[PDB]
């Protein structure tokens with residue numbers, strides 16, 4: 364009867380998607396009607412998850428995946444954790460790369476990062492899911508969906524905090 | 540990669556497209572918390588339909604934000620008519636009626652935008668951390684497309700599924716009803 368909620372302020376949320384994966388996936392003979400593609404995707408995600416085990420990213424929290432899109436976040440308990448999220452996205456790229464050269468593919472990550480206040484919480488009676496709701500999230504997501512392949516799009520606000528840390532963000536502020 | 544294969548499963552993407560506009564985070568809004576409570580109320584009410592014998596064959600895959608994803612046909616007892624496609628339409632009507640009972644109690648005017656499609660699907664769990672089950676495939680990406688390109692308060696359905704629906708009794712424009 365009670366809605367499980369906890370508010371957090373200043374959490375960096377990332378939406379790391381592989382926009383060309385929907386084109387790749389095919390279903391027919393060679394693929395086994397899709398099964399070969401899901402295995403690759405399963406391979407890609409499980410490899411990304413493996414980064415979470417690195418002490419370097421002990422503060423990163425995988426929320427879940429939406430299809431091939433990966434959602435993570437630092438801050439679920441200033442700026443260090445915002446810089447950690449950028450290091451994690453770089454780490455996702457490098458893992459996607461190690462996969463592209465083993466599976467003979469050319470996948471590219473399109474990351475969208477943003478920080479701010481958030482409300483984590485569980486919705487629904489059957490099959491309850493823990494999301495991160497809010498505007499900083501819908502904006503983190505917007506950075507991704509309007510982002511650029513192989514690049515990390517970041518809002519004007521977050522770009523500054525990043526500079527405070529050391530990341531030179533190209534001005535539409537991107538980073539690599 | 541645990542996976543299973545199913546042929547002919549009706550998958551529905553029932554979304555509330557105006558909810559993103561509604562949501563806000565202010566003084567008179569509890570920085571969003573009041574909105575999540577409404578959404579939590581809307582989803583938990585939808586889930587309550589699954590308990591109806593009428594929909595014992597309906598299975599909730601997940602919700603994506605405010606979007607609800609369900610499906611008939613995943614019943615896994617190695618049996619491989621088009622009744623379960625008609626069940627999915629009855630379930631979407633049922634989501635509308637529950638959304639309505641909520642609009643009149645919370646003084647809102649939310650509208651559901653449903654996308655239904657049937658076909659072969661691969662249910663499976665992906666990811667080491669927070670592994671999550673789904674329904675992958677083209678019938679799914681199409682069920683989804685029916686939703687995302689759908690019309691408020693209407694159920695968009697592909698040419699193929701529209702026919703099966705007529706075989707069952709559903710009036711079909713060029714949208715079930």
Ligand SMILES: C=C[C@@]1(C)CC(=O)[C@]2(O)[C@@]3(C)[C@@H](O)CCC(C)(C)[C@@H]3[C@H](O)[C@H](OC(C)=O)[C@@]2(C)O1
Nearest residue numbers: 494495496497500501504559562603604605606
């Ligand atoms: C519920 C609120 C609102 C407005 C804000 C929000 O946090 C979201 O739930 C996120 C961003 C957020 O929950 C992260 C997951 C996902 C799937 C990316 C959501 C959707 O984009 C939602 O939009 C829809 C239409 O569900 C959105 C944007 O809706």
Ligand SMILES: C=C[C@@]1(C)CC(=O)[C@]2(O)[C@@]3(C)[C@@H](O)CCC(C)(C)[C@@H]3[C@H](O)[C@H](OC(C)=O)[C@@]2(C)O1
Nearest residue numbers: 384385388429430431432674675676679680683
């Ligand atoms: C992984 C495969 C592929 C190509 C096919 C598929 O089944 C999907 O995973 C669904 C449709 C499917 O898993 C149902 C949930 C949701 C959220 C609707 C998925 C996304 O639209 C995926 O797209 C993305 C871009 O992640 C998509 C379409 O990607």
